[PDB]
Paper text:
The α7 subunit is a component of the α ring, and it self-assembles into a homo-tetradecamer consisting of two layers of α7 heptameric rings. Interestingly, the human α7 subunit, one of seven heterogeneous α subunits, self-assembles exclusively into a homo-tetradecamer with a double heptameric ring structure, while the α1–α6 subunits are under equilibrium between the monomeric and dimeric forms in vitro.
The 2D class averages showed a dislocated α7 double ring called “dislocated” and a symmetric one called “symmetric”. The ratios of these three distinct types in 2D images were 23% symmetric, 62% dislocated, and 5% open. The symmetric type showed that the D7-symmetric double ring was approximately similar to the previously reported crystal structure. Compared to the crystal structure, the symmetric type double ring of the cryo-EM map was stacked with a twist of approximately 15° and a separation of approximately 3 Å between the two rings. The results suggest that the twisting and separation of the α7 double ring in solution cause further dislocated and open structures.
Residue numbers in the entry:
A (entry chain A), B (entry chain A), C (entry chain A), D (entry chain A), E (entry chain A), F (entry chain A): 2 to 245
Amino acid sequence: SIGTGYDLSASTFSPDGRVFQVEYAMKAVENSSTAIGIRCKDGVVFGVEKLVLSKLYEEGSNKRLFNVDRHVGMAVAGLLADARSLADIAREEASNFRSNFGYNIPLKHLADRVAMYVHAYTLYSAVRPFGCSFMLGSYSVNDGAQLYMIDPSGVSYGYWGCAIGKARQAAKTEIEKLQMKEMTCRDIVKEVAKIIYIVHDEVKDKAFELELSWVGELTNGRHEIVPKDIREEAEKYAKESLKE
Amino acid sequence: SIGTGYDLSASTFSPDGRVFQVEYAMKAVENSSTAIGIRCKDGVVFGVEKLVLSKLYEEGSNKRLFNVDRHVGMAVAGLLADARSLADIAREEASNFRSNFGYNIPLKHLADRVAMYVHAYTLYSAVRPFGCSFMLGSYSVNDGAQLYMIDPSGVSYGYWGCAIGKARQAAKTEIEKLQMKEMTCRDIVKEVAKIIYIVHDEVKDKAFELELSWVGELTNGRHEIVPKDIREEAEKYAKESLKE
Amino acid sequence: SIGTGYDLSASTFSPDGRVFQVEYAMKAVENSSTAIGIRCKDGVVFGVEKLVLSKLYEEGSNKRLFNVDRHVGMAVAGLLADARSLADIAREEASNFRSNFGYNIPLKHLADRVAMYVHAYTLYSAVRPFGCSFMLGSYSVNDGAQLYMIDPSGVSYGYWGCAIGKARQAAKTEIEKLQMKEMTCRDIVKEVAKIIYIVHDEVKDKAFELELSWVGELTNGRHEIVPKDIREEAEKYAKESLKE
Amino acid sequence: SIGTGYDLSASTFSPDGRVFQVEYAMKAVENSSTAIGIRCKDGVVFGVEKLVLSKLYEEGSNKRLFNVDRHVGMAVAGLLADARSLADIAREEASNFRSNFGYNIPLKHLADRVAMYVHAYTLYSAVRPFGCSFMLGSYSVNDGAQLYMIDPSGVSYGYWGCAIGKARQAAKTEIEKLQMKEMTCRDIVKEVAKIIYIVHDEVKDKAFELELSWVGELTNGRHEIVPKDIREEAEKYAKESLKE
Amino acid sequence: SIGTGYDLSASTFSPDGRVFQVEYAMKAVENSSTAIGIRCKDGVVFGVEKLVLSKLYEEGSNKRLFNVDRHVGMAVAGLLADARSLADIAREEASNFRSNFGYNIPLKHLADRVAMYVHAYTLYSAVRPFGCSFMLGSYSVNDGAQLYMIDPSGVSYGYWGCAIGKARQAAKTEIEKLQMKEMTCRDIVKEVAKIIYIVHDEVKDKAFELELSWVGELTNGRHEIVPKDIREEAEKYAKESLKE
Amino acid sequence: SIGTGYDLSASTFSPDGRVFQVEYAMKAVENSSTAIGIRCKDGVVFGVEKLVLSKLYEEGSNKRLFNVDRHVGMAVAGLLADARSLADIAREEASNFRSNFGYNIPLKHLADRVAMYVHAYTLYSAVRPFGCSFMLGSYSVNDGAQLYMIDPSGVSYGYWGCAIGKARQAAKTEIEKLQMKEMTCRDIVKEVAKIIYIVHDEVKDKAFELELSWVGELTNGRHEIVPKDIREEAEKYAKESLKE
């Protein structure tokens, strides 16, 4: 509890140098499950630790993945409603950005403006800043496969392999173990689902379901969801890992 | 009472990661009675636990169901006045959305914008956020039977069977028991009124009245209220359940 | 005193789920006297417990009834000045609503917009929300006799017989006793003044004067005040009740 | 051909004192058929000389009568398209005028503003002034049966019996013969259809069809079209006249 | 050549009563080929006399039919570029009109506003009025099969069978011969293509191609083009007529 | 010289039906040289009859081809300055249109809005309408190879092979001779340069230079100019034709 009076409406700084809304949003991220994203050599594919709680839900729904453009997706974590509001405002802002650019969409300045809108609600006191994270990734030809992760603190870090959520530590160690630039996207995403559901603890956390969505060379550049054969294949691949 | 100074105007985060307005609105929902909604295979029909208190009321009035379009309804719970304000603003926004679309109304982006307006009043300090919930459901042909539940935290979750209100736990277990995709809407809605008024405790809660409203194939796609023969039929069906 | 820090500017929620401005406005209503309204089968007539305090007042003045349209009246309770401001803003809004509609005025969406303006000042912090209540009632032919009661919490409940003010409990029991749909308006309003001035306690409360105003079939659809013969007749009728 | 250079864009006056656009619009009116309107003692009913040309038309369509409000109609003559534009703009202006007034709609200032909009397009040079005429008539209780005829020159003349169109001379003589204030509306409108289709010359003009629409006491104040029994009855009544 | 100085910028009237822009636009319509539209009992189907001139054209292109909504089409004649501008502005205005209405689109006030925009450019002098015609037709269930023809003079006439273009006289006689309300749409549209390409003179006019597009019961309410089997079937049907 | 007083500022119509600005712009087009465009099966490639007059010019400059997007070009004819203004305004409008659309750019509604801006300056009198023509063509994968020709009269006609300029007659006959849909783009564009410089008369017209620019499959979808080897190859191919 660092801060007495500082952390009330902490747009005002404390002499540690820690804006306590950033700790709000980060701890809210580590309250939610661990979703990662990776920038392989001919695609950018995301993955979400989706949590099964009951039978009243809907499969295919409860989706923490969100299309932004034809090949731009949004792998959210944190709080879902503000992330969907960010998805809508980023939809209109990606409309403005493929206005601005002539070719297919160059994710750099796109994610810069999206992170600008993220950090713009972080120095006032009307409502809260966005206590959620999300990952933007685009695959192209004239500019290639790009991946950028907008933190809740507005400092958008790009990655060849990223990790947000609860168990970010083991996830980022295992991402820094893998060959994030070398192999093709398909084996690497099998390894992604494999190792992330190794990281899934089945006792402290409840039941789980695979959540993943393509974009790359074999999917004709479309931001496709992972199909049911490849979904069950990655499920069996993670089960081969978890049986050991 | 998690939060000392955090939960004053809790647009500012606390280091747990829990925006305390969301707990305001959720506990306000569990203070009100339990209303559910279900997405059957040829319709989307809602249901409200309506509470009888006195004879000064009006039957047909005290309606916690609200038409939004010709086949779009709003099954509210929480606080009624802000829910009716949301009904009016969603009426103009559904006007803007059936402006935007060419066919009959595609509830997805509709409920996205409605949940955006829900979460937009959740980071300021002029007045409160909406301490109420509501369910949007549309039945169509070119896009089908769609159901979406906008939480008070702005993360609109769609469902094949949903549940909000006080006794959400037993209600969502019984919804995850039923065949929410398999049987026709009529037997399923009989089972809905049946099991929800099983869940109605007559001692801790006061007297009750059935509240339900159609839209589906037999109702010519009109968002009709359940008629008095089908109302008394579902009453007798729930009484057949409650006699056991 | 539920709420420590919550109830300062309680647009922010407390984890009970009770927006404390609603308790401000409701307790302010139960501080003021008990005024009721009833929707009989060929009219909508209001009634106010008017309190005699001194001889410096003016009879015909101190009116807690307010015309809104030619057949739309406003039976206020709570605080009078904000209720008159609501009367003025509802005058311009009823102007906008009989702009919008072609026939005589359909009170439903009218009272919806009025209750929207009521609840719109309930989530900010510049000045207070409206700590007062009022009843809207319209009698027509193409749409009939309609009655709607806008609470201070913005959830406008319609009634066939309503009751607001201090002694709402005994008043609403006696309204749920009477035949609010069956007899003609004239005998029912005699019973209204009768039973409401039975409910008037002459010891704890000070002296009283009858306040009532017609609209119905015999008054040519005009929102007339109750005339002096019918006023003294209802006074004598309540005295016949109170002599027992 | 009075005017050499004057009548080019005759917003500029000629020293006769005749704005030649008024002669454009009047001669355009006398090019179209003769439609009259009459203000009887408990209604205001219009009538149009409708011209049958071929079988490709639609009966009930080709309507030169236009509803403006629930009891306000528009009996047009001249050019039909600008008259329908005047019908639309008068629809929004009647919306603004039943905004302004509290009771049912007082046609006087309504037709004043409509004639103001008529004459407002008569001193410029972008497009033409309205080369058409129309009759406004309202029947009420608090203000009664009112009839007003807006000329194309903007000087709205009210009438107890009016006449516009081609054979205005014989029509206005026969209107000044009849009892426009004395008898009930039904016999008078039978006499209207009678004498106007006496005035219809079947050789110089082509085939004809009766066009008439009620508003009055028997029609519950609704601006109804004349029903088929009363239509064929007035046809037979005019045939009884024309057989002589 | 009626009018010396009048017909220069003929927003100013001449004392005949004939706005010479209406003669511009009508003679421009009779310069273009004859396209008709008909309102059969379960659909509204259009037809265009398309003129084959060379092999450099594109079949399926040179389309004088234009979709406005999912079941609203635009059968143009006159000048094509201003008709496509009217198609675009009517696209945004139909967006505004299915904003305004709750059910499927009621063509009446739609075509009223479109004809208002037609006549609005007819009294100024910046550029020309629209020297082209078009036909709007909608098929529905709650409001049915509606057909409306907006003339270039802004007086939108609805029809059960219409005809615009060059040989309007023989076309409208043959439309007033046929059973425009009685038979099903399919045989009637075969008769439409039959008789209209009887009316096509192959000597004075050059080569022709069938142009027709459905909307009705068998086409699932979609404004479909006539398929190639039904196109060649109607070609052979017109050839069976023309062989006699 | 059809029209006495009509053709002064001919936004006003003449009773022939010929807006004389369209004849201004068309005769201005036939004053300039003949440029064609063709929609082959895997590309849309343009071609301009460029006229050599002196040595003071610049090769690569005097370009009557204009890039609009990465694969959208503009083959102009008529007057060059207004065509470059149309190129700039179409650049911003194509920015607005690839705002609006999600995939690569769908030329249909693009050219519709561009032709709307063309025809929008054709009914006023401040400055002239655009006395020039231009051809828009886009090659894609999700929507394909599209070609559209915006006339100066605003009626944008799409083509599989088009022709504008001076000798449009022989050019369009030879385009309707060729296989505009069958062969690959490369041989067809060789035939284009071949036959168009057959059509070039070297006596009445002065010296000429080849002007052509690709977009298609071999050019990686880039709107490339024809390279110097393929330029001189098409020159030699046209010389092989012209030697006969």
